[PDB]
Amino acid sequence: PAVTYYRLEEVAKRNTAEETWMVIHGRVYDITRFLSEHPGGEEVLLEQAGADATESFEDVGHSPDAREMLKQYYIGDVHPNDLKP
């Protein structure tokens, strides 16, 4: 299978509105175009851009519909050596 992998070092560089990546559950999402659409606003996303936002994403209690949106932004998996517990 042709899965794309990213190191966290790479993901961390995509930390502004120019190109915004985020890790949730060991996957990388490019949410650049979603910033202006996110119901929770842009700032909560930018504050964790380039980082692992799993804990915040889960703590907010996002709906099943919100979760299903992730397929629009998925760009690859975190490299296995860089996965969080």
| Alpha-carbon span 85 to 83, nearest angstrom | 7
Q: Which residue is nearest to ligand HEM (CB)?
A: 40
Q: Of residues 27, 69, 76, 77, which one binds ligand HEM by CB under 6 A?
A: 69
| 28 CA to centre of own chain | 5
Q: Of residues 48, 49, 50, 52, which one binds ligand HEM by CB under 6 A?
A: 48
Q: Which DSSP letter does residue 39 get?
A: T
Q: Of residues 32, 42, 46, 62, which one binds ligand HEM by CB under 6 A?
A: 62
Query: Are the beta carbons of 29 and 73 closer than 8 angstroms?
Result: yes
Asked if 27 touches ligand HEM (CB under 6 A), the answer is no
